[PDB]
Ligand binder design. Structure first.
Ligand SMILES: CC(C)Nc1cc(N2CCC3(CC2)CN(c2ccc(CN4CCC(C)(C)CC4)cc2)CC(=O)N3)ncn1
Lengths: 199, 243
């Protein structure tokens, strides 16, 4: 079901096996050290492996999570095959520890044998204005749609500004549960007959 | 505007549209403090790296990767990982490792940890195509996207941005942008600086360059050591000479 869908939940406790398989996964995790974080062990323990058989993972990282994100990506069964950077500019296309930071990194991982994707349509550099702090640039969605048009996608640790057609968005600041895909709706009621997602 | 859609529409890479893309006193201090350029032709595989003394404050490592020769001895990450870099690095010292844009972003990190560093910066060399918007890209089989940048990883053991933007060099040109030296020298990390796999074309005051394609050598270990004997042992490279 094409229009946006979402589940407010503690991603730690949701049984994601109800969601089906996805052509693309994207996560922008709250890595450990305002909002709720996950420890490194919790990050590692996420059930990312059930979300795909063949497809791509997009994993935003920063600081020391550049290394820890590579660990989770490998632990969850992916090989890192690309690394996207977003060059942060102002509205006049000028660039906003040891150096000042002008970019953010998004690791790109592959699982299995993805077929029918339009690899090589975009390049690995995004140039876009910092619209709102902590927000990823909307350009990533277009890149992912050109790469895998029409397919099912899931975002972990998203926020209401993140919901998109063809995407299911998970995060704890979303507005209740809004599911439209009949296969998903069926499995959710079965798994959660009283609509409560508990530990 | 969406510059990614634009690049799909026109072939102009998004980085083409970035604009503007007393620190002169620091530079002049760097130049006064710089040792004479020193350089040595050596096949680094067959060379006991321990013959390079004393222990270096900065190491810039630029191994010639196969991926640099798209349409053209290559070192593999297997070979690079076997370099005994921790034998020549000072207990507090810095490394700058050109990792390319593929598997090197991972194996380069294995290298840094193997030699005892932790990564504190990731410097990306972003290549514009303003002069050849049409020219496409033979993609790596595993690549998902067109690769238009290279990473230089900075590691530590014991004013500037992390971006370098220049036009993509001519095919077969393997030179890295000289801006990396400015970034490095503006850190004021000490004066013993080693460039492994440098070339005649990268020799530079304040650096010892070692690599197989140098046509001449002037390296002498004792002469080299003499530049850092007391009172000059601990200079940052950004302070006045001691009278
Ligand atoms: C309670 C917890 C145990 N369990 C959760 C938490 C959860 N969250 C928390 C996180 C969420 C969404 C809901 C995202 N977050 C956020 C902020 C910054 C970054 C960094 N990143 C770096 C790259 C970049 C610059 C391109 C964009 C920013 C990453 C994430 C802000 C926020 O407020 N909320 N959702 C379900 N379970």
């Amino acid at each position: 079901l094409f229009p946006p869908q979402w589940i407010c939940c503690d991603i730690r406790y949701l049984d994601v096996s109800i969601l089906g398989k996805f052509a693309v996964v994207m996560a922008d995790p709250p890595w450990d050290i305002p909002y709720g974080t996950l420890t490194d062990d919790e990050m590692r323990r996420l059930n990312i492996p059930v979300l795909q058989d063949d497809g791509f993972l997009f994993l935003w990282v920063t600081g020391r999570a550049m290394e820890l994100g590579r660990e989770c990506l490998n632990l969850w069964g992916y090989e890192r095959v690309d690394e996207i950077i977003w060059v942060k500019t102002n509205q006049l296309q000028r660039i906003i520890h040891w150096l000042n930071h002008g970019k953010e990194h998004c690791l790109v991982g592959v699982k299995g044998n993805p077929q029918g994707f339009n690899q090589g349509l975009d390049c690995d550099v995004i140039v876009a204005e910092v619209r709102s702090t902590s927000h990823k640039p909307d350009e990533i969605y277009g890149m992912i749609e050109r790469l895998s048009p029409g397919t099912r996608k899931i975002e972990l640790f998203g926020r209401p500004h993140n919901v998109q057609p063809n995407w299911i968005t998970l995060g704890n600041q979303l507005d209740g549960i809004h599911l439209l895909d009949p296969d998903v709706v069926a499995r959710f009621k079965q798994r959660y007959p009283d609509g409560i997602i508990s530990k | 505007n969406d510059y990614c859609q634009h690049f799909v529409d026109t072939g102009h890479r998004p980085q083409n549209f970035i604009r503007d893309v007393l620190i002169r006193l620091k530079d002049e201090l760097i130049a006064k403090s710089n040792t004479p350029p020193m350089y040595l032709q050596a096949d680094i595989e067959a060379f006991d790296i321990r013959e390079l003394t004393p222990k270096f404050d900065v190491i810039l490592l630029e191994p010639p990767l196969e991926e640099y020769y798209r349409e053209t001895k290559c070192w593999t990450w297997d070979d690079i990982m076997k370099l005994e870099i921790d034998e020549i690095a000072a207990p507090r010292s810095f490394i700058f490792l050109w990792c390319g844009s593929g598997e090197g972003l991972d194996l380069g990190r294995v290298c840094l940890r193997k030699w005892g560093y932790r990564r504190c910066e990731d410097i990306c060399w972003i290549k514009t195509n303003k002069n050849n918007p049409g020219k496409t890209k033979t993609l790596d089989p595993k690549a998902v996207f067109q690769r238009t940048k290279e990473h230089c990883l900075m590691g530590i053991k014991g004013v500037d941005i992390d971006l370098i933007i220049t036009e993509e060099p001519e095919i077969g040109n393997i030179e890295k942008p000289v801006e990396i030296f400015h970034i490095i020298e503006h850190f004021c990390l000490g004066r013993r600086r080693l460039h492994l796999f440098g070339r005649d074309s990268t020799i530079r005051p304040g650096w010892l360059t070692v690599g197989p394609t140098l046509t001449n050598s002037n390296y002498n270990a004792e002469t080299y050591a003499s530049y850092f004997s007391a009172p000059n042992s601990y200079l940052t490279g950004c302070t006045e000479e001691i009278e």
